Design a protein around this ligand. Structure first.
Ligand SMILES: *[C@@H]1O[C@H](CO)[C@@H](O[C@@H]2O[C@H](CO)[C@@H](O)[C@H](O)[C@H]2NC(C)=O)[C@H](O)[C@H]1NC(C)=O
Ligand SMILES: *[C@@H]1O[C@H](CO)[C@@H](O[C@@H]2O[C@H](CO)[C@@H](O)[C@H](O)[C@H]2NC(C)=O)[C@H](O)[C@H]1NC(C)=O
Ligand SMILES: *[C@@H]1O[C@H](CO)[C@@H](O[C@@H]2O[C@H](CO)[C@@H](O)[C@H](O)[C@H]2NC(C)=O)[C@H](O)[C@H]1NC(C)=O
Ligand SMILES: *[C@@H]1O[C@H](CO)[C@@H](O[C@@H]2O[C@H](CO)[C@@H](O)[C@H](O)[C@H]2NC(C)=O)[C@H](O)[C@H]1NC(C)=O
Ligand SMILES: *[C@@H]1O[C@H](CO)[C@@H](O[C@@H]2O[C@H](CO)[C@@H](O)[C@H](O)[C@H]2NC(C)=O)[C@H](O)[C@H]1NC(C)=O
Ligand SMILES: *[C@@H]1O[C@H](CO)[C@@H](O[C@@H]2O[C@H](CO)[C@@H](O)[C@H](O)[C@H]2NC(C)=O)[C@H](O)[C@H]1NC(C)=O
Ligand SMILES: *[C@@H]1O[C@H](CO)[C@@H](O[C@@H]2O[C@H](CO)[C@@H](O)[C@H](O)[C@H]2NC(C)=O)[C@H](O)[C@H]1NC(C)=O
Ligand code: NAG
Ligand code: NAG
Ligand code: NAG
Ligand code: NAG
Ligand code: CA
Ligand code: CA
Ligand code: CA
Ligand code: CA
Lengths: 444, 444, 444, 444
């Protein structure tokens, strides 16, 4: 179990609104990395997922032997203090799922006594998945600290003949009230109930108006069209949550809960968080709006089962991501787009602490500082409109990809540490080196 | 425990003399590295030690937060096959000794149910250790797989007032007949019994004559002087073995067994191996002879206690190491030298299988292919006089340091794999990145 | 162990009713304090707990680095005579629980061979604890004189879903018939069995009638309402006792025994005492009645387990405490109040020695002599209606807070000494300086 | 024993000459004080002595019940890290020597397994001691951690009829090569061998010339006269060292070793230190030169017994002390003086590391910043000519007295902490409150 110094400093808003204004990033600190490196120049390690809870943490990433176009590495352990005062992620178990099953886009989550991981089995190019009317096989693997492993092929209702494809968001899932929730996304088939119930719905971030040159009627029209991709088999690209009861005999008990397209952007990879008793969702900006999308999620239970989800966006115009064409970091107008990168963000302040939800919110993470290239990885702290602290890693031109950020407090020294897991392009070993950067978020 | 595919393919001579002639190195294979990386540009990870036995493996290295001038990372696990057929070193436990005790030059060894590690506590520059008449504190830490940890300060007899300094060789120790043996080295004080019993002794490798331009009388004179260093407090630089009975209450039961200077070169870092029931020793070439030094060690027991050791050198003139001044890779004449690098080698063939010990021996490892710089890491297979297979890693100029090689056979596919643990200079994260390269040693 | 001069003079009523009338306080005596001071102007040391038994004493207090809004200091030792004749509390062991766990409101008790301490883990403002339906984590730490330490998270039955919060009373617990008893208090949830069984119950001290201007029917109505706080999450503020069997593997064996609200006032901090074989309870006056509340407790065992407690109040109208608003030291009428200070009192005379329980009782302690401010610390001796001896410490305006009093007799010189542990506001080092004042209670 | 984080960071020069230039004092940190407070307004606690060694620390001070014109408190324990990273001096044993023997001016020293304390028995005003030809009784008490206590009255040779008085310097003694060394001082009788061998000797600090307005011949004449006090019975006020072999049956084995008056100023209180294998001495400036006096001491052994001592002064003109009349902090000219205060200093840099001994030395401690009053306690870091960092404690006018400073490094976090034990005048409890201030000495 995690050291006494951390058990009470996990999954919470660490600073008050007032303190958020005076936060700065400290130096990067050196700890033994718990994320394995490739041993060949061409080896590819990508798509990390990290979940940290009161008792322990779970980590996983995909490994491809030659180039990035597989096996899945899983790790679990605890956090303990070093003589220098900062954390050391102590690995207590390692697993390497290598058996011919092409598990991809995996999301992992901590569960009592272990880790639960959700993946889909890839057997063809992603685009092909959207055209085929049949969805890929879905699997959830439970790995207990006692070395028992139980993998199950799941068939949640409302998937067959509704979703042409379904993928985990790769971002971490969370254990909530006895259920394990994972972010999901995919393409929905035209004419289905889901498609019809979503017809004419769209979402436009609160701060777009002041930045978009188009008029309200034009924005609305374009936003509605941003949820359908002709390139991806003419499907409605949908975001949602997969709720699975913690059981070892899962078959069709997991539930697919899509977000209303009136509250969320075009479906994309994502991540789920827990701040106190509240669930939050991060949605990759793979559509027209290039800014960090975070939402407070309200989950409704009907007869002990998740029945519906509602999302409330934390309005911002900060931390853009690189994109292609008319959907770069400089875009501000609605339209159909299918480009971007995963770059989640951690809320250091409570958005509900303000009279108007998210009026003044502070968050931290990493982002690729450039308009269209996956370059210049930069760790930062920002509020709704400005970056109040940042530090680029490496020299300009340094290639990078996804970034997963997680923060926690050591209740002993009373300092907050954040880990920024970044896929870095390496010239020595492997295509990428996934690095768990760690530093302190200093108040002052 | 290690998978059934490896339990019977460890610590043995894998090929016959005839087969050794047709061995070649296969491609480097990509597996998730079990050696942790640094998370800052200046973080320094160095001095690895690796021990692999029938049941499991132990690994460790030193971590310094800023630059390479500390904490000690320890790891243990097993080996299991991947769907591609090659090994995956599965970590089952990690430890990070971080408590203010500056444990250095650590050597680790597998023991039933865990790992036993031997280190010395550094409190001043190495050179200062040789001048002070008092030796540094010596410690042996036993780490059981059940998480029990027992560290002891040891005071073996014949150390105080005999050795000005004593260090583990950093290379792996071995578990032999109930005792854990570690390679050691240091400086002996003038006028001591050890010094007197070693007076006038010297060793000249069998193949030096044909390569050295000096006459026999001159070589002998210079060789005798190569065991005394005026730079290192005027001490006799001695190599030896530390034998410790496997106990949890060690105090003064461990025994210091020095090698006779008539059979070994000037003391240096080293490593111990087990090939069947035979113990072998690798001695770093930190003196005048720049070639790989391997010896078969004969251990004598008197009353259940190791009482003396004898070494028989495997005569070679292959695989040189970079050195400074008149002691570079091109040197062949005896004289005092104190320069070199650690680069052990694994014997793929049995030296005793030939009528004349080591007349035709084959070994593999890595070496820095250059005369004086620690550059051009190159993995190879060689016999007594030639390199019969090799492959440089990276582009010329690539900096590197130590290299620890370990080979084992998968008795299922019947192929031999060797892991080359190499300290590589990295430009991205940390001063060095210790990489566990792995490939196959192919017969044909 | 305590010196022979004290082993037989602990936890007893030292004077007869007749002698109690002629008791006066002697000068304060100077002994080396056994309570550590802060080393910074802002350091905060508060909330002491002190337990003294036949063999030894246990002491503890909370330490907060900046201001009083943590770590827990623990100390244990014995009492021995000085050449001047008075006591010296000799510390034989010190401990500083500093590990990130925010242990608060701790109560300590002597146990054979050590100390047992009970705390709760605070993670949010106190008021928040009452609103959340989940109670804070509860912990009991046993610290043996042999340096073994065993901490356990306890989950006594009848706490979850009954008590929104639960805290130790901070006053000392006592070792009784193999069980360690601690005073407790907190908020009970509406609709629970406890709440229902307590419905319509109330307690009005025997001497209130003659001092209250309201009529009997009005007093009764207001008293009933004094047990419910809308400010503290609409909970019934309850007082009680936590009984824990002396074991090192405690989980759910400790028992929560609430006092009947027909015999005790609104729940508050408290302390348990032992006078001979009788258990006594002190209840902080945090409600409407501002006078010292002491009760003789009768404990019932069913099958070797504490099953119920009954309290009999020692009727007084002496020694008031400062309070806010209509609940100051001058208040005498029932109503809802949530203000006051901890100020226990030691009974120098046996309340049962009189035909009518407590008809003539004498006690000693400290109290803040003022109506609404925590000012003017004053040590005293008093009977049911008057203060018969007193001495203010410092000059008027001197700030102070809690006061823990403990008396014992030196059977050698035959004199009674009392220690008054008082939190004093200091201008030099720290926010408060907890001082163990000591003097004699003279007969004459 | 001390935590692993400190065992290797004690009694050493922590910084290089270059680093000494960039040292600053950090904030004062709050830890539970290990020095007991008085419990009455008039209680007097004074004259602390503190010794810290690899394994543990020893502490002691004098306690007088009424005013400062007795009993002796002794404490011993270890150092361990807190969750905030800084030290906590954990007391493991306390003792209170209270038995009618007036032990004064005690100096304490750590010894293997305990503490050895040296005191003299006062029976009359100090001045009377100098006039009486008979010296006061001398005692050394050994207190082992196992609670065994052995006190002995000692009669070292060369004391009777030579020294009219003899006192420990109150500063800590040190354990050196099997002997416990304590600083001493007193008055020598006219006509004795010591007096004759010291006749015409004098010492003038290297930096006095440039600051003194008198000529060389006048300075020399006045300096010679500064070693004789007509006020103190016309004795030669001498400084020295008392060497005692670590034995439990001491009688006349301890040796009185006086310093040559050609290398040291008029006798005064003092302290002994150990930096590596070197012994250093601090001499209170109770004579004409008001600046910090530190000397490297060379001890000569003849037949296993200390036979002579030699002192080499570290030349400075920094950190003056308050004095009376023509001997205030502003004085610079030789002459007879008998005024000053104890204020030792710790060397953060090695004086021998410079080509010219002490040419650039850095030290830290506390000093009363004023010309003639014991006021304005101020902690500082200084070099030979300037104070490069300082912070006054309290508001101007704050009375204080002695200051004992001790520094050590936590080899885990790699930071240096210094404890400044200062006698502070308090208005609340006791005449003085001896406070163990602690902070970090930051490099940068
Ligand atoms: C490892 O821990 C898991 C989690 O408890 C154990 O799982 C139990 O498995 C049995 C069937 O094999 C179920 O009936 C239980 O309900 C499971 N426990 C629950 C509720 O999670 C697993 O058995 C453990 N490994 C072993 C066999 O030691
Ligand atoms: C985000 O942070 C920025 C920078 O701190 C805030 O901008 C400052 O706003 C204050 C007004 O309260 C001005 O006094 C400063 O001059 C602004 N800084 C500058 C120069 O840009 C910004 O208001 C924050 N956004 C919010 C309100 O969340
Ligand atoms: C080491 O390997 C080399 C290369 O295989 C051996 O050299 C060969 O020796 C044979 C004689 O048996 C010749 O026919 C080849 O022409 C040699 N190779 C060349 C061209 O260098 C060498 O003999 C081996 N060393 C030993 C005997 O251990
Ligand atoms: C310190 O004293 C305690 C109190 O006796 C010892 O506790 C015992 O612990 C063992 C398990 O470790 C139990 O089985 C015993 O019942 C305990 N004794 C009882 C009844 O209190 C503790 O072991 C002592 N410390 C040591 C190990 O020397
Ligand atoms: C508490 O103590 C007071 C003071 O000693 C008692 O009051 C005295 O009562 C006696 C009657 O027995 C009178 O003779 C005195 O004049 C009273 N003292 C004064 C002047 O106040 C009081 O009775 C005691 N309370 C009890 C009975 O416990
Ligand atoms: C506490 O420790 C001291 C230190 O070892 C013990 O002292 C020994 O006392 C005996 C006589 O009583 C001597 O003969 C030994 O030489 C002493 N030891 C030495 C060399 O220091 C002391 O006895 C211990 N306390 C006990 C009795 O347990
Ligand atoms: C003690 O410290 C002072 C302050 O750092 C030193 O004075 C400085 O000396 C340098 C020359 O190397 C000048 O450049 C600075 O201007 C001086 N500081 C000032 C303005 O006073 C002083 O030299 C040090 N004393 C020594 C040499 O030990
Ligand atoms: C943060 O720093 C600013 C600038 O000094 C200060 O005014 C503010 O009070 C700080 N915020 C808080 C309340 O911690
Ligand atoms: C190795 O290869 C050579 C060349 O083909 C062959 O002649 C030889 O028999 C082989 N060695 C053995 C016996 O495996
Ligand atoms: C206490 O003092 C009173 C007044 O002198 C005296 O009458 C009484 O007897 C004393 N009490 C006892 C019995 O000790
Ligand atoms: C100390 O700080 C000064 C000023 O920045 C810098 O020049 C110097 O190198 C530092 N000293 C060292 C070597 O640590
Ligand atoms: Ca499909
Ligand atoms: Ca040495
Ligand atoms: Ca609650
Ligand atoms: Ca005298």
């Amino acid at each position: 179990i995690n050291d006494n110094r951390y058990i009470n400093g996990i999954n919470q808003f660490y600073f008050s609104i007032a303190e958020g204004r005076n936060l700065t990033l400290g130096p990067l600190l050196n700890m033994p990395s718990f994320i394995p490196t490739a041993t060949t120049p061409e080896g590819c390690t990508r798509i990390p997922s990290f979940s940290l809870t009161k008792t322990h943490w779970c980590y996983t990433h995909n490994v491809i032997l030659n180039g990035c176009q597989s096996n899945q590495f899983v790790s679990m352990g605890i956090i303990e203090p070093t003589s220098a005062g900062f954390p050391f992620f102590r690995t207590l178990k390692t697993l390497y799922l290598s058996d011919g099953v092409n598990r991809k886009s995996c999301s992992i989550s901590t569960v009592p006594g272990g880790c639960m991981m959700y993946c889909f089995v890839s057997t063809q190019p992603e685009r092909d998945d959207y055209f085929s009317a049949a969805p890929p096989e879905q699997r959830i693997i439970i790995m207990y600290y006692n070395d028992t492993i139980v993998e199950r092929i799941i068939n949640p209702p409302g998937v067959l003949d509704v979703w042409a494809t379904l993928n985990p968001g790769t971002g971490s899932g969370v254990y909530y009230l006895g259920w394990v929730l994972f972010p999901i996304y995919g393409g929905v088939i035209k004419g289905t109930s889901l498609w019809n119930n979503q017809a004419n719905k769209y979402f436009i971030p609160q701060m777009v108006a002041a930045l978009c040159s188009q008029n309200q009627a034009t924005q609305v029209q374009n936003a509605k069209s941003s949820y359908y991709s002709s390139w991806f088999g003419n499907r409605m690209i949908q975001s949602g949550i997969l709720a699975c009861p913690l059981r070892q005999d899962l078959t069709n008990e997991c539930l697919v809960l899509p977000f209303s397209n009136d509250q969320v952007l075009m479906g994309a990879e994502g991540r789920l968080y827990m701040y106190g008793d509240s669930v939050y969702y991060y949605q990759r900006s793979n559509s027209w709006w290039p800014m960090t999308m975070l939402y407070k999620v309200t989950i409704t239970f009907t007869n002990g089962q998740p029945s519906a989800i509602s999302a409330q966006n934390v309005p911002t115009q900060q931390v853009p991501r690189p994109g292609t064409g008319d959907c770069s970091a400089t875009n501000r107008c609605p339209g159909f787009c299918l480009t971007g990168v995963y770059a989640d963000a951690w809320l250091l302040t409570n958005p509900s602490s303000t009279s108007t939800f998210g009026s003044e919110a502070t968050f931290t993470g990493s982002y690729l500082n450039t308009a269209t290239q996956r370059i210049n990885p930069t760790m930062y702290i920002a509020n709704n409109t400005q970056i109040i602290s940042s530090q680029q890693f490496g020299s300009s031109g340094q290639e990078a990809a996804y970034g997963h950020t997680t923060c926690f407090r050591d209740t002993g020294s009373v300092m907050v540490y954040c880990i920024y897991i970044i896929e870095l392009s390496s010239s020595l070993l492997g295509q990428f080196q996934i690095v768990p950067f760690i530093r302190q978020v200093t108040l002052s």
